[PDB]
Design a protein around this ligand. Structure first.
Ligand SMILES: CN(C)CC(=O)Nc1ccc2c(c1O)C(=O)C1=C(O)[C@]3(O)C(=O)C(C(N)=O)=C(O)[C@@H](N(C)C)[C@@H]3C[C@@H]1C2
Ligand SMILES: CN(C)CC(=O)Nc1ccc2c(c1O)C(=O)C1=C(O)[C@]3(O)C(=O)C(C(N)=O)=C(O)[C@@H](N(C)C)[C@@H]3C[C@@H]1C2
Ligand SMILES: [Mg+2]
Ligand SMILES: [Mg+2]
Lengths: 197, 197
């Protein structure tokens, strides 16, 4: 195929879908593109640079709810942004694993900056707004991971029923439920001000 | 060294600390123990069986707050149990990655069963109690992961300050903060009953 940022990424995405993050090796990428390793090396220097680019690309191509709508509430944003995040993280095999460890990329600077400011101008201190943003991120990541990494791998009464409930759907209900509890818990903090809550 | 469940696990734990979950190969384990691969194979059948055992052992050896104290509140348990969980997950390199994908092991059946019943007899339905337990688990996992996997790998004003705050300590504050918001959010649900909250 052609060898430019976009073509290379597409092949990388398709390859991830087939072999998972572990099967994803520059060697396999070369074959997929129908080229020799030295040709690939000229474009993609290594596995981490390749994965970093993927983490970025996955979000820019599927994470539709990144910036808040006109006059939207901080609660609705956190909910919508979290859902979008989870959605994008699921689009690809090991998607959540690819994202793991990454920090805002330059292209994202704009988007993340805006998220932080939006939270402050709604009553959050940089600290608290950051923490709300973080908790949502950490909660979404772990849920998706435990879901994906689970599928890719004598019981007592309550536990038994628990296990059936956890298979009813692909962890979606439990997530949305936890998401609400998280957002609400943030409310009780914002409105609590300096009072003992 | 000796080759029995405990000696093999110890070597596996020490090895994980040195090479990470990826460097952890049955081949490297054999050398560490000072034995030949076929000797190891007689004991440890494969990487997954080895990792599963580790996930179990890490918790049984460091997760001290697994069952609730006499007459303890569901909020204090969720908080203490979550802290212990995070603590154990940090004790070893890639600890959170080892745990990923695992389900309660037979030895744990007792412990998990008890956690579920304790939540129900405090007003939670199996469903809701499960979800509270899950959200805590998913939140703790993701925080630890993003922390560990981060270390093992032109900025705008707000984002810049945000990044400094996220390095102040090893993600502990942000976690405890999110933990409280999560627990509180669960309260608002329990006491809300059938009323529109
Ligand atoms: C502890 N260590 C990871 C260092 C550290 O905390 N730095 C960080 C400091 C600040 C951030 C960080 C990290 O890692 C992110 O990774 C964010 C996202 O991925 C994003 O989803 C993020 O990048 C985007 C996005 N591009 O749209 C989001 O939608 C945010 N929501 C909450 C899902 C989220 C914003 C985070 C900002
Ligand atoms: C979606 N998929 C993973 C399937 C599924 O959800 N099954 C599951 C169904 C039910 C559970 C599950 C999974 O995976 C656990 O993994 C739990 C723990 O690891 C534990 O930390 C857990 O094993 C222990 C423990 N042994 O002490 C804990 O302390 C619990 N707290 C909340 C940290 C937690 C209980 C979970 C029960
Ligand atoms: Mg991230
Ligand atoms: Mg688990």
């Amino acid at each position: 195929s052609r060898l430019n940022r976009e073509s290379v990424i597409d092949a990388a995405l398709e390859l991830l879908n087939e072999t998972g993050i572990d099967g994803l090796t520059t060697r396999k990428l070369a074959q997929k593109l129908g080229i020799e390793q030295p040709t690939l090396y000229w474009h993609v220097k290594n596995k981490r640079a390749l994965l970093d680019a993927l983490a970025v690309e996955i979000l820019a191509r599927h994470h539709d709810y990144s910036l808040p709508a006109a006059g939207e509430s901080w609660q609705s944003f956190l909910r919508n942004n979290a859902m979008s995040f989870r959605r994008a993280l699921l689009r690809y095999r090991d998607g959540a694993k690819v994202h793991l460890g990454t920090r805002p990329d330059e292209k994202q600077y704009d988007t993340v900056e805006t998220q932080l400011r939006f939270m402050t101008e709604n009553g959050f201190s940089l600290r608290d707004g950051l923490y709300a943003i973080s908790a949502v991120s950490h909660f979404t990541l772990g849920a998706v991971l435990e879901q994906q990494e689970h599928t890719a791998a004598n019981l007592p009464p309550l536990l038994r029923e628990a296990l059936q409930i956890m298979d009813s759907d692909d962890g979606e209900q439990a997530f949305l439920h936890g998401l609400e509890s998280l957002i609400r818990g943030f409310e009780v903090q914002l409105t609590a001000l300096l009072q003992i809550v």
